[PDB]
Amino acid sequence: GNSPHELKNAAQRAADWLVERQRPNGALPSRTAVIESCYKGMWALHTAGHTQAASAVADYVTSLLQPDGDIPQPREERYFLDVHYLYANGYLTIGAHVLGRFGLSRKLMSFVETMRNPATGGFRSHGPAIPGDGRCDSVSTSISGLAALYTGRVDTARSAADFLGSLWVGQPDRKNVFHAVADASGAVLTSDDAVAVQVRKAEGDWYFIGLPAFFLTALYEATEDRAYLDLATDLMTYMDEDCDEDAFVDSSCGKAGVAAALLYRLTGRPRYREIAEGIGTLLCERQSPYGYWSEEETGDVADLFWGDLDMTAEYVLWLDLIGRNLASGERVWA
Amino acid sequence: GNSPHELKNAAQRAADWLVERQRPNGALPSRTAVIESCYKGMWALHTAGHTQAASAVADYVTSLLQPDGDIPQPREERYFLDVHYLYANGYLTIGAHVLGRFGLSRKLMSFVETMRNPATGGFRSHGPAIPGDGRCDSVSTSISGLAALYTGRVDTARSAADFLGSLWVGQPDRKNVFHAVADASGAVLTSDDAVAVQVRKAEGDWYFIGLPAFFLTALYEATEDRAYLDLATDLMTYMDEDCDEDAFVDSSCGKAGVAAALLYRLTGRPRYREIAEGIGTLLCERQSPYGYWSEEETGDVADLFWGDLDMTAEYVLWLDLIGRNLASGERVWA
């Protein structure tokens, strides 16, 4: 497969594509003005070295920030309302913090903490304006824990890991389905309206497992508490051995690829290098000749549907993280 | 002078020069193998988007890390022994944290905190192998406070700001000298063995004032506490109106340039834009056509004396920070 240098070259061409089309107010070129079009942009563009463009996204995000530290609008996609509302807030917090926008990151992260369930450590799936039952899911919890790690709120991250452990141990039928949501008391939810990954089918949503694996590995790196490494290990084993091959092929596989690349750097296990290399190469092969990623668009377009803009920024970030952990992993272990 | 985009383009030329000459273990191309040649490298190369190179520096740094979280060797320059020992550790902590190397950043920052004076908030000037009297200086304290901000240890940052305020209030002759050091009890040291900037002379050492100004402005951004804004602006006004013109011309002026750029974004005051623009343009003017900066060398060299290599990574960072704060300041204040 492709070398770390080649993975990064792909990321850089996509970052250049994004910045060439960035709007004067800092918004990325989405066909709809929604926060789910650009929430990964600060972090992705900073990793690519495009710090003025990343700071311009920070300016745009700051213009939307409400007194309570949330960005409730503009939001349209239901997954950003009642499935994992905080998924936008978590990447915004990380990107703001690494840019040194410490006021923005403190305000964002302080709002994220108001949606934490103090009994279970999970983070509520639905935002303040969105009626709901207090359920908490694996993605809201893992991204909020990762944002807690970058902002130095390690106790909040450890409690997010506790929730993920309970969600894993509590699965009623893990060989057939991964139920990614718990009720407010931490019992796994099996209702039709709660996200489930059909693990023996090729139907996506694998990031409900892969993002927890990435976050837990980062938490192990931060703390050296082997409980977190063991849970990350168990989730990677689950995806590799009990899940359909689509777990490492679907567009959502990048989180598991990043987790594998980090696990390779920390442990040296070659299967993790293989998983990360395969995923990085797949994403590289799917890139358009112009620089963006889309599963449908094929032309020299000036803007993208919000989901493709999000995917494009996401793959700048994942190819960067995969490449740097693979390159350092080779230095350490090979 | 130069536009924000031009400042960034200069930073990128320098980062490419460094990466092309990076050694297999991750060290940067210094004529002596010393930590003072590469301590700014992780942060500088990450801001330039060269994350594999930055991670390679992190691998080298990790290999030198001692059980107590310090890197006591290799060190040769006395400023990194008894004047501001922790100046190296502070940039290492920031660079490790922004790379997501959370175990490295936790261990480095925890060592830094063992050198904090709990009564004064200052950080001791001399490292563990180096005898001394417990004196604490403005540079050790400011860089340790900035590392605390990046790692989320905000109480430590507030305490460092307390030290800086006391140092500033306690100056006995600010018109003529800035005494950058206090004793273990918190009283300003005026002996000739303690760093003293001759503020009415063109003799350098301005970063003992400019780095506090940058750190205090970042702390204001993080907290909105106007006490920190007011101390930062007092220091900028001091450098602009009471110090020799050399304060904005000497090679040490970059910290003040970054502080001015941030203050412009936060306050809109046009003089801060002018100071930042002037400093960024001067740094760009002094860059070798080959991409590095050097006090004496001009050709196509394969490596550099440690101080020139440090300055080169330093100006990658400062040109980037000046550029993004001026670009965003223009957007905000238009």
Option in A59, A153, A321 nearest B332 (CB): A59
CB contact under 8 A, A153 and B149: no
CA angle centred on B250, ends B244 and B254, rounded to 5°: 110
Looking at the structure of chain A, the number of domains it has is 1
What distance in Å separates the CA atoms of residue B119 and residue B231, rounded to the nearest whole number? 21
CB A235 within 8 A of CB A208: no
CB B259 within 8 A of CB B286: no
Residues in A touching B52 (Cβ below 8 Å): 4-5, 8, 323-324, 327-328
Grouping H, G, I as helix, E, B as strand and the rest as coil, residue A215 is helix
* Structural domain of A182: 4-333
Resolved by: X-ray
Terminal-residue alpha carbon distance, chain A? 17
CB B290 within 8 A of CB B16: no
- Stretch (H or E) spanning B222: helix B207-223
- Stretch (H or E) spanning A198: strand A196-198
Option in A58, A153, A222 nearest B102 (CB): A222
CB contact under 8 A, B149 and A50: no
In chain A, after which residues is the C-to-N distance over 2.5 Å, breaking the chain?
none
For A166-186, b/e burial (b = at least 16 CB within 10 A) is bbbeebeebeebbbbbbbbeb
Residue in chain B nearest A63 by alpha carbon:
B332
Distances (CA, A) of B132 to A273, B141, B145: 48, 16, 22
| Tokens linked to A286 | 């799917």
Residues in B touching A317 (Cβ below 8 Å): none
Terminal-residue alpha carbon distance, chain B? 18
Q: Which residues contact B235 (CB under 8 A, 6 or more apart)?
A: B168, B209, B210, B212, B213, B216, B259
What distance in Å separates the CA atoms of residue A77 and residue A83, rounded to the nearest whole number? 10
CB B216 within 8 A of CB B162: no
Paired strand residues for A116: A123
CB A103 within 8 A of CB A65: no
Resolution limit in angstroms?
A: 1.4
Distances (CA, A) of A283 to A214, A255, A322, B173, B211: 18, 12, 11, 63, 42
| Tokens linked to B83 | 């004047």
| Tokens linked to B176 | 């003529």
What distance in Å separates the CA atoms of residue A287 and residue B84, rounded to the nearest whole number? 48
CA angle centred on A313, ends A310 and A314, rounded to 5°: 80
Residues in B touching A52 (Cβ below 8 Å): 4-5, 8, 323-324, 327-328
What distance in Å separates the CA atoms of residue A19 and residue B64, rounded to the nearest whole number? 38
What distance in Å separates the CA atoms of residue A283 and residue A253, rounded to the nearest whole number? 9
Option in A49, A59, A153 nearest B47 (CB): A49
What distance in Å separates the CA atoms of residue A307 and residue A251, rounded to the nearest whole number? 11
Q: For residue B204, is it left (φ>0), alpha (ψ between -120 and 50) or beta? A: left
Residues in A touching B54 (Cβ below 8 Å): 324
What distance in Å separates the CA atoms of residue A197 and residue B133, rounded to the nearest whole number? 62
Q: Look-up: residue for tokens 């910045």?
A: A19
What distance in Å separates the CA atoms of residue B35 and residue B294, rounded to the nearest whole number? 18
Please compute Rg for chain A using Cα positions: 18
Q: Of B199, B170, B202, B210, nearest to B186 (Cα)?
A: B170
| Tokens linked to B103 | 């175990």
Q: Can you state the angle between helices B270-286 and B306-333, rounded to 10 degrees? A: 150
| Tokens linked to A190 | 């099996």
Mutate to test the interface with A, among B20, B22, B43, B51 (most CBs of A within 10 A): B51
Q: What are phi and psi of A304, to 5 degrees?
A: -140, 150
A183-190: Cβ within 8 A, 24+ apart: A183/A133, A183/A134, A183/A135, A184/A117, A184/A119, A184/A120, A184/A133, A184/A134, A184/A135, A184/A136, A185/A119, A185/A120, A186/A117, A186/A119, A186/A120, A186/A122, A186/A136, A189/A135
Q: How far is CA B175 from the centre of its chain?
A: 24
Pairing, β A136-137 against β A181-182: antiparallel
Option in B52, B99, B323 nearest A327 (CB): B52
Distances (CA, A) of B27 to A3, A321, A326, B86: 21, 21, 18, 20
Residues in A touching B49 (Cβ below 8 Å): 12, 15, 47-50
Q: For residue B49, is it left (φ>0), alpha (ψ between -120 and 50) or beta? A: left
Q: Of B292, B299, B230, nearest to B266 (Cα)?
A: B230
Q: Domain containing A220 — which CATH number? A: 1.50.10.10
